[PDB]
Amino acid sequence: GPMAMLARRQRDPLQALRRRNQELKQQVDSLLSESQLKEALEPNKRQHIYQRCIQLKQAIDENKNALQKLSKADESAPVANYNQRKEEEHTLLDKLTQQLQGLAVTISRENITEVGAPT
């Protein structure tokens, strides 16, 4: 068509995924922005942050699954820096996973109301 001049040329799934990963990071930073607020000391907000944390964690794990599935070694695509960027992407997403996971548990243990196991 009349758009035969795409300078982007986003072939590699790594680039598409990285775009989404960068977006996830912005959401994580935003979540931390909530956990950084004094108004977030509100008991109710803790559960709300906990919910947002689980959602993002699910999203990152989803990307991690996608990234693992987009490892076409049977195809002549993984060339040196390709595998390097793929591994480094694991490093970033993993820390974000741990960042949320650690925070989530920390917040989840702010609900020390039930000291037993009721049905």
Instruction: Please say whether the beta carbons of 26 and 92 come within 8 A.
Output: no
Computed on alpha carbons and rounded to an integer, the radius of gyration of the chain in Å comes to 19
List of residues 6+ apart from 13 with CB closer than 8 A? 66, 70
Domain membership of residue 43 as a residue range: 1-119
Ramachandran assignment for 42, one of left (phi > 0), alpha (psi -120 to 50 degrees), beta (any other): beta
Reference 35, options 109, 107, 116, 113; nearest CA is 107
CA 76-23-65 angle, 5° bins: 45
Number of domains in the chain: 1
Residue 67 phi, psi dihedral angles, 5° rounding? -60, -40
Residue 116 phi, psi dihedral angles, 5° rounding? -155, -170
3-state secondary structure of 44: helix
